[PDB]
Symmetry: D2
Subunit: 101 residues, 4 copies
């Protein structure tokens, strides 16, 4: 990891059961939408993606309203649609973690 | 303001000098990772900080950032979503 | 708070109900010992002190086994008993506590 | 290794040069203001330990991410003593700024 730090920590509940899929060689890719709100109620939705082991467990133990802790990195990946688009996500890979609260 | 923790910590370098329009500086940083692959963040500072960055942050500048993620919805010339790291309430920025 | 970043993030459980105490002018001080463990087990205990509002709430809502999220700073303070140091996670400025 | 999250993030400067014994002990200072500086006892192992010994000198500014660990030791008077430190192990990390 040259250059600075890139890290996000989230604590929220999934607004929907874990969308588990399996990419080609090595099926293991889970997608969760984490919700975190605040007052002073303004809520924000998060697109997280878990891999390998974290994916599976996500799939086996995580369900809609579940609350979880997430430590991941911020990544924005572009893609041209059936019509250029960009989507930034919180990916959990290397020094990352996911956990049931 | 409970129910969940929205927090991103960043340390890295600016791509271009601070684009301050109006008490709001928009800064885009870079964070490399190797095993190359750089990643670019859209950080947005307000009030006090906005001005400090404007006055002390130049292109190369290395900084520490702590804010929250916010995805905002806008329609363009012809729907679009832009997620950025906003240093608001309990956030903070500093020169390294 | 220029120069450096002092910040710890904890998620764990309270080992025992919050020991709330009221300081001189403006009583609001809570003391919680947080437990975080690691298997692969090996646990580690943390002293956490809350203040004002967060203190009150802890008192009211937290109990023994409850699980929390803590964000604060590290402060080791010296005191000679009857020379010693005690390091703790203190929730002051940009800190926070949350029941999970 | 669940049940709770033990994590401290630090950015700051070394008091002395790295005291290497693969294990580097460094101490870090983070000041606050409203002065009042605070001193951290950081411990690096293996790979990082050596890097620190090789590139970190007194003034060096570094980013640290580790876990808190309080160690219980006895001490010549045969009295119990406790020392908490920031240990950069598993998912930890250190970097020069």
């Amino acid at each position: 990891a040259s250059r600075g730090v890139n890290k996000v920590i989230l604590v929220g509940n999934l607004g929907q059961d874990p969308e588990v899929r399996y990419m080609p060689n090595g099926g293991a890719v889970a997608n969760i939408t984490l919700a975190t709100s605040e007052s002073w109620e303004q809520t924000e939705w998060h697109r997280v993606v878990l891999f390998g082991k974290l994916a599976e467990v996500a799939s086996e133990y995580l369900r809609k309203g579940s609350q979880v802790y997430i430590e991941g990195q911020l990544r924005t990946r572009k893609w041209t649609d059936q019509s250029d688009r960009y989507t930034t996500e919180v990916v959990v890979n290397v020094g990352g973690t996911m956990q049931m609260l």
